[model samples]
Target: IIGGEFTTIENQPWFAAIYRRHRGGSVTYVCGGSLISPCWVISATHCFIDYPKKEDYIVYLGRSRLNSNTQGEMKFEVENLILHKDYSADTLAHHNDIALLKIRSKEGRCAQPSRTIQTIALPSMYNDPQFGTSCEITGFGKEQSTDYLYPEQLKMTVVKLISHRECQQPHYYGSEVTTKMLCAADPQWKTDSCQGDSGGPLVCSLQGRMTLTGIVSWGRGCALKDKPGVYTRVSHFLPWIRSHTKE
Candidate 1:
């Protein structure tokens, strides 16, 4: 959400805030996620590479503000953590960077639909947006590269999709940008996703419906000129997601 503006929770009901709790009773946010179904959430696999215990993790939904209480905010305990089997963090290539999270209420029931919390639709496996398509990303990430202050409220920005060739050219991510990934950024370098925004949703409108198209995965830096942000292409992992989330 670096250099982004505040966004309303009602507009992005699928957004989820991921948090980790320490033995000392301190809670901290680690990443962002999207609610794809009543019991399923999707995020970046690298965010879970540390492999924290399930008891240490929590998910928050329907909240526009992170630090303040928002009416109707729902919290859930993670029932399962599913990281992609092929995820490799050291290759600098970020292949298979997506992960799924299973959630359940304290009473052992799946999440219920509400006005402030709901699931977002996923794009078709064969559906891919053309270059220069305008999309939006939302998160509570940092405000700037030099600032240590993180956002207290959810923020969003519109970014244009950049082609793989332009993203992999000299000074950019190069070969590290692969077919499994998509690139997006502001051409003017004024706005972009940043630290803490990883695992968030990259949504685009198709056929008049908001579709989940990508997951914030990696980038060279925050809003650097010519270095577009990289995301885990959601369309490429439809098989994996469907298999894992089947009823």
Candidate 2:
């Protein structure tokens, strides 16, 4: 959320907060996710690399504030963690950085939709997303690289999709950027996703409907010159997602 402005869940109801519980009952905010279906959430595979246990994670819905337990906030424990088979953090190129979380309440059902909570539509398999299209990303990530601090409220900013060819230039991510990934940023490099923002959604309005197109994956640095943020191209993995969620 570097160089971004505060936003609300009412405007981005699909946004979700993922947290990990530590010893002594302390909880740590880990990453952001998108509710693509009632029981399935999409996020970066890197987020669960270490804490892979479903019991260690909790999904929070319907809240603009991270710490506040508003009546609208509904908490659910994770039921399963499904990372892409090819995801590898050690690879020079961060490939297949997406993952899915199956969540459920104690009653064994997903979160209920409300005024402040809802699901985002996945990009249609027939849809052809283009470069230079305007899109938005929202999360409660850090404001700067040096700061360990994170926003209490969600933040959002506009970014334009960059072509994979341009993103593969030596000055950028080079060969590390692949068709499985999408690059996006303001050419001026004024705003970009940062720490704590991984696994968030990159939503684009297409034909009068907002579509989830990417998952925040990786970047060289926060808002660096010529280094746009890279994300897992959702359109490239439609078959995999459909097989898992049956949606």
lDDT of 1 by residue, 1-247 (tens): 7776898789889999999888899988889999999999999888887964677788888989877868998888989888899998756457899988898879897767899999999999868789899999999888897878788989999999988888888777778888889999997988999989999999999888899989998887798888788899999999999998863
Deviating ranges (above 4 Å) for candidate 2? 90-92, 126-128
User: How many clashing residue pairs appear in each of the predictions shown?
Assistant: 0, 0
In model 1, state the lDDT of residue 125: 87
Candidate 2 residue-wise lDDT, 141-242, digit = tens = 889988877888889999999998899899988888988889999978999999889999999999989999999989988899988998888988999998
Error of 1 at 165 (Å): 1.7
What lDDT score is found at residue 101 in candidate 2?
Answer: 91
* lDDT score for candidate 1 against the true structure: 0.88
Candidate 2, TM-score vs. the true structure?
0.96
